[PDB]
Curated annotation (Swiss-Prot), chains A, B:
GO BP term, pick one: pentose-phosphate shunt
Entry binding sites for NADP(+): 9-14, 32-34, 74-76, 102
Subcellular location as annotated: Cytoplasm
Protein name: 6-phosphogluconate dehydrogenase, decarboxylating
EC number annotated for this UniProt entry: 1.1.1.44
Oligomer and partners: Homodimer.
Enzyme class: oxidoreductase
Catalytic residues as annotated in Swiss-Prot or TrEMBL: 183, 190
Binding site for substrate: 102, 128, 130, 186-187, 191, 260, 287, 446, 452
Modified-residue entries (N6-acetyllysine), positions: 37
Purpose: Catalyzes the oxidative decarboxylation of 6-phosphogluconate to ribulose 5-phosphate and CO(2), with concomitant reduction of NADP to NADPH.
Major site of localization recorded for this protein: cytoplasm
Any one of the GO CC terms: cytoplasm
Length: 473, 473
């Protein structure tokens, strides 16, 4: 009994987190499967720190103060269960296991119940910000068994990133899967935000003909307006960056976007629960499309585009319009993001604090921005808000951005620039805005070809079946 | 031994199919869980037919000739397994169970293996066309254990719908889940096609101001061009239809589109396998959006649209442009549809005949059209075709439709008409066409914030990690 908490997982993320913990005055007993890495760590990155290193799970379990708090930061699916397998022999009733890997929300749900059943408090939390984030201030998103929360509270919130008015970007999210689900809606939104920038970039590059210096300059001006955000910032950096030969490196790298499943999963949940999260879906699908790199080289030789009409208009005005389109669209993506969180709250019965979450994403994580701030006080102003687009700030920000957004999409469309996410955003906006949508023809068709029944507009609730076929005959 | 085949499931679909079978000279032993319905059937719809009716599963099993062929048309998930449970006691090695319900492709895979294991040949087939389809000519899509196929061959293909040059719209699709998967990609495409028409309809209604008579007239002209298809045909009918008070009924019915999971599932599979099936996804999401009927009535009061600019242009030209937009988009949806089938062929290792499938969808089913014909001889012309957009017919049909399609989307966008599917279609087309897409910035960002590595454009295969952060400092 001396180590406050133990962490199993000596990858960069685990090391940088153990280190941040130590720096906040917590003694950490490090453990890892290939126990050599523990020794390596102790001699190297952890030399001179207060950290203890175990060489067996039972040693690690002995070094702990009660209630035993151990953390699993094992990149995993299977591997987490196996560790849980091992640990429960060794644990007293009331001991805590936190799982920091980006797990599947349902696995977390399962695990939490099972361990609760065997007296152990399980919490799964999303950790975000990468390795430099892990080191000095991660967003942390904990969920599972709330009994554990006062016991891990101090650590989690001390190592958490802290926003301007000193609050940690870490607070308990909710029951069983809540943290892990919140975590993966986050990565979904992250996918959305990067595709929106790729599109803004494609429009400046092919329609406006800007070279990468001017383009980087534009991204920098943008990081000083409503778009003050980490991804706009590093984008200006990436565009500026010059290689060993002094030429820009972005033109050099292969356009096949990789994935590690979390964004895919956000889109799949929307589909399962019937939540119209369209930009994230479009984003996952735009990464799928770039993977067909060979196929597009082939299609370009054969499929033809619109007649080339040079951009005839002011470049500065257009650069403005793209700013406004990227922003109005970002709003729609986030609005859809929290509709997902909302529906899952009804689905699994969790009382999520949407402003709490907005705040946990305001610092630490890759999607940090001034923007999550305005989202947070939309939900402070009204925590029962049904949809972000109805909060006056956003309601007005979109209303203002509106014909710049339409003018950016019309030119892109004319010019042949692929804009999946920019167009879904307009399509969702106009969809949601309309109190009468042609979905009644879907319904009339379905009652016709497949006997499905339909409701009248006045008298919701009663279902009718008209015999269309022949109106006599 | 007298009944050629047995069918368990006396719903309208089961009755109309038993009846079609009888008419092709096959003695059918009908069975159903609530055995009263068998008696009801025999006295009523089946009076004077050659059909036999059982009153117990073991009686039904006795009435059968060997190899025993029984059909499950039980609307189900669970219920099918339970019947399989019952039936295997009663069956000899080599007996066949066909499952006609719209099952989950993975359940079918499972079931096929398990029964193959116990000597029984399982085949799951999609059945399509509804009850009037079932009666006189269903599309049938069989998959599972090919040993069973010569034994059910005659029945299935005799009752199948037959296309102009006399071939049945039924041929063996492939192993284990192939039939059931082909079936559900079909319903996905069906979703796509109806949303595209709702959009064409929304543009004629709000931009062009056409009343439902003229609108119906337009749909009828369209069913006489490249768009000769059953859904264009019944749409003209639905628009014309007048209620008991002599006013049009479509304006009367509630715009909240229902779902029964199959379209949802197509979109989810695309996401799981990384296949960019975007219109179907947009379609499922446009039905999700209409379900939020109360929410849109609320949003309409608060969210504002573009400045109302009257349509200033020729109505007839625009009606043309919408024809061309609906068509170019339909092409992109189908092209994506078969990319899904293709990837599943690589995924589960089935040798699907894409022209075979195109043909099975050419008659019978709700998506029947002259269009599936041209798709079929694209794949006859080249069965190794990687993507429908590369077949000269389509390659040219899109090239022709192209600035009508762009002009329809630009006006819709300006006017505020929600067009999810029409815009994804342009976005996928321009995406696929481009041999260089901004996905390299996604990659550069990911190597920066999350150490993910990237390939150079020349030298695919080697992965680099640049330390961006500071280029010195
Ligand atoms: N199957 C497994 N069982 C337990 N831990 C594992 C594991 N697979 C991966 N991990 C751990 O996940 C962490 C990050 O990938 C590593 O510490 C790794 O342990 P290792 O050091 O033994 O590779
Ligand atoms: N749980 C169940 N077990 C077996 N058959 C079922 C069933 N649930 C639904 N079905 C059958 O599915 C068919 C179409 O819905 C019906 O014939 C129905 O039988 P029923 O006639 O007894 O309702």
């Amino acid at each position: 009994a001396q180590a406050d908490i133990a962490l199993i997982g000596l990858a960069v993320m685990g090391q940088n987190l153990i280190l941040n913990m130590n720096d906040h005055g917590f003694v950490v007993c490090a453990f890892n499967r290939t126990v050599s890495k523990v020794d390596d760590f102790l001699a190297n990155e952890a030399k001179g720190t207060k950290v203890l290193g175990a060489h067996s799970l039972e040693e690690m379990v002995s070094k702990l103060k009660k209630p035993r708090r151990i953390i699993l930061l094992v990149k995993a699916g299977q591997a987490v269960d196996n560790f849980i397998e091992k640990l429960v022999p060794l644990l007293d009733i009331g001991d805590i296991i936190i799982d920091g890997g980006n797990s599947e929300y349902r696995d977390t749900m399962r695990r939490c119940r099972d361990l609760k059943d065997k007296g152990i408090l399980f919490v799964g939390s999303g950790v975000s910000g990468g390795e430099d984030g892990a080191r000095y201030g991660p967003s942390l998103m904990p969920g599972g068994n709330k009994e554990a929360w006062p016991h891990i509270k101090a650590i989690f919130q001390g190592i958490a990133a802290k926003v301007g008015t000193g609050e940690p970007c870490c607070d308990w999210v909710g029951d069983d899967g809540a943290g892990h689900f919140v975590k993966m809606v986050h990565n979904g939104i992250e996918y959305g935000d990067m595709q929106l920038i790729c599109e803004a970039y494609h429009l400046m590059k092919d329609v406006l003909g800007l070279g990468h210096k001017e383009m980087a300059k534009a991204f920098e001006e943008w990081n000083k307006t409503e778009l003050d955000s980490f991804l706009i910032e590093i984008t200006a950096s990436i565009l500026k960056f010059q290689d060993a030969d002094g030429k820009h490196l972005l033109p050099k790298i292969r356009d096949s976007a990789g994935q590690k499943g979390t964004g895919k999963w956000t889109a799949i949940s929307a589909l399962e629960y019937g939540v119209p999260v369209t930009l994230i879906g479009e984003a996952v699908f735009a990464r799928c499309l770039s993977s067909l790199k060979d196929e597009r080289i082939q299609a370009s030789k054969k499929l033809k585009g619109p007649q080339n009409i040079p951009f005839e208009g002011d470049k500065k005005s257009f650069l403005e319009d793209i700013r406004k389109a990227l922003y109005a669209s970002k709003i729609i993506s986030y609005a859809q993001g929290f509709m997902l969180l909302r529906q899952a709250a009804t689905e699994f019965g969790w009382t999520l604090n949407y402003g709490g979450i907005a705040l946990m994403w305001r610092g630490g994580c890759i999607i940090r921005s001034v923007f999550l701030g305005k989202i947070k006080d939309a939900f402070d102003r009204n925590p029962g808000l049904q949809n972000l687009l109805l909060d006056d700030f956003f309601k007005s920000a979109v209303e203002n951005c509106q014909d710049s957004w339409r003018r950016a999409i019309s030119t892109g469309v004319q010019a042949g620039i692929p804009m999946p996410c920019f167009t879904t955003a307009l399509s969702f906006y106009d969809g949601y805005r309309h109190a009468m949508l042609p979905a009644n023809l879907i319904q009339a068709q379905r009652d016709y070809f497949g006997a499905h029944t339909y409701e009248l507009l006045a008298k919701p609730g009663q279902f009718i079946h008209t015999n269309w076929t022949g109106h006599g005959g």
